[PDB]
């Protein structure tokens, strides 16, 4: 209703975006809207959720969060451009080693530590929401499902949701730790657990089986298996916080972020 639209209109910038930005080039299509490149920036063209998202993004700037630049009123959102694409492209088309996985996990944990200390829960951590820079920069985006703080809304993407979310229990920031654990499984196996199943049967599987099992756990080092176990603990109090996990031994084997640029080149070659 008009009252929420007025609040949204008071938040967006005024002036012609067609006059501030040039060289529009379409680079994608999805559920939300159409993504363009301009001058380098990335512009997504598409109620109370759009307000929460713009507000949370302006208020929570961090080097491990894609920079929100501007918005215009149908609704255009201007972000920094990360030319290396998404982590999804890398996870589905390449074999990442433990040093590369640890580098990505560390970057994601730094973004989560920042968010959780600012009482923000992302609730939609997945490889699709991780953007890569041409230098190997790792950044988090899509704050549409975020909540400012316990919660009990069944919010997220089925395959990456924590059991306490799926079962509609009072939950906290550690739901993002579980989702990161699922994203580390994506990095290992190419997919989150139960992707072959329909989203509802995955929800039942998360609620009944709990901690998912790896297809080949013997292939992982002892320190990596432990890191995953701390991410995917059933008991929320036992599950590690972002601050605690930043000190885990697994992150000490992290390779420089430059080690990710051959993966970006491989993903770009596979998806052409
Ligand atoms: O999309 C968003 C976005 C997200 C939100 C969150 O709601 C808000 C607003 C925006 Cl503008 C991006 C923000 N910065 C980006 N930097 C790079 C890319 C990028 C690079 N390559 N690709 C594609 C993937 C499909 N295949 C062809 C290549 C996309 C996308 C964005």
Curated annotation (Swiss-Prot):
Positions carrying Phosphothreonine = 153
What compartments host this protein?
A: Cytoplasm; Cell junction, Focal adhesion; Cell projection, Lamellipodium; Cell membrane
Tissue expression per record: Overexpressed in gastric cancer cells and tissues (at protein level).
Q: What is the effect of changing residue 159 to C?
A: In IDDMSSD; gain-of-function; enhanced PAK1 kinase activity and significantly reduced homodimerization
Which residues hold ATP?
27-35, 44, 80-82
Catalytic residues (positions): 124
Report domain Protein kinase positions.
21-251
**What happens to this protein after translation, modification-wise?**
Autophosphorylated in trans, meaning that in a dimer, one kinase molecule phosphorylates the other one. Phosphorylated by JAK2 in response to PRL; this increases PAK1 kinase activity.
Tell me where in this chain the PTM Phosphotyrosine is found: 36
Q: Oligomeric state and partners?
A: Homodimer; homodimerization results in autoinhibition. Active as monomer. Interacts with GIT1. Component of cytoplasmic complexes, which also contains PXN, ARHGEF7 and GIT1. Interacts with NISCH. Interacts with DVL1; mediates the formation of a DVL1, MUSK and PAK1 ternary complex involved in AChR clustering. Binds to the caspase-cleaved p110 isoform of CDC2L1 and CDC2L2, p110C, but not the full-length proteins. Interacts with ARHGEF7. Interacts tightly with GTP-bound but not GDP-bound CDC42/P21 and RAC1. Interacts with SCRIB. Interacts with PDPK1. Interacts (via kinase domain) with RAF1.
Pathology linked to this chain's protein: Intellectual developmental disorder with macrocephaly, seizures, and speech delay: An autosomal dominant neurodevelopmental disorder characterized by impaired intellectual development, poor speech, postnatal macrocephaly, and seizures.
Q: What is the similarity comment for this entry?
A: Belongs to the protein kinase superfamily. STE Ser/Thr protein kinase family. STE20 subfamily.
As for what it does, the entry says: Protein kinase involved in intracellular signaling pathways downstream of integrins and receptor-type kinases that plays an important role in cytoskeleton dynamics, in cell adhesion, migration, proliferation, apoptosis, mitosis, and in vesicle-mediated transport processes. Can directly phosphorylate BAD and protects cells against apoptosis. Activated by interaction with CDC42 and RAC1. Functions as a GTPase effector that links the Rho-related GTPases CDC42 and RAC1 to the JNK MAP kinase pathway. Phosphorylates and activates MAP2K1, and thereby mediates activation of downstream MAP kinases.
Descriptive protein name: Serine/threonine-protein kinase PAK 1
According to its UniProt entry, this protein's organism is Homo sapiens
Span within the full-length protein is 250 to 542 of 545
């Amino acid at each position: 209703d008009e009252e929420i639209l007025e609040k949204l209109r008071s938040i967006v910038s005024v002036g012609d975006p067609k006059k501030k930005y040039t060289r529009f080039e379409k680079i994608g299509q999805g559920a939300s809207g159409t993504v363009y490149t301009a001058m380098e920036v990335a512009i997504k063209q598409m109620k109370e959720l759009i307000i929460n998202e713009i507000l949370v993004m302006r208020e929570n700037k961090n080097p491990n969060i894609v920079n929100y630049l501007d918005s215009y009123l149908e609704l255009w959102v201007v972000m920094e451009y990360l030319a290396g694409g998404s982590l999804t492209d890398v996870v589905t088309e390449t074999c990442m080693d433990e040093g590369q996985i640890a580098a990505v996990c560390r970057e994601c944990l730094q973004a989560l530590e920042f968010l959780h200390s600012n009482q923000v829960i992302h609730r939609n951590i997945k490889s699709d929401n991780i953007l890569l820079g041409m230098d190997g920069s790792v950044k988090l985006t899509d704050f549409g499902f975020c909540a400012q703080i316990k919660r009990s809304e069944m919010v997220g993407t089925p395959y990456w949701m924590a059991p306490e979310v799926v079962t509609r229990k009072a939950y906290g920031p550690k739901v993002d730790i579980w989702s990161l654990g699922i994203m580390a499984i994506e990095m290992i196996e190419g997919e989150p657990p139960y992707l072959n199943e329909n989203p509802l049967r995955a929800l039942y599987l998360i609620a009944t089986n709990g901690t998912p099992e790896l297809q080949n756990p013997e292939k992982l080092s002892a320190i990596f298996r432990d890191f995953l176990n701390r991410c995917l603990d059933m008991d929320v109090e036992k599950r590690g916080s972002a601050k605690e996990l930043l000190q885990h031994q697994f992150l000490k084997i992290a390779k420089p972020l430059s080690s990710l640029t051959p993966l970006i080149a491989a993903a770009k070659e596979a998806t052409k």
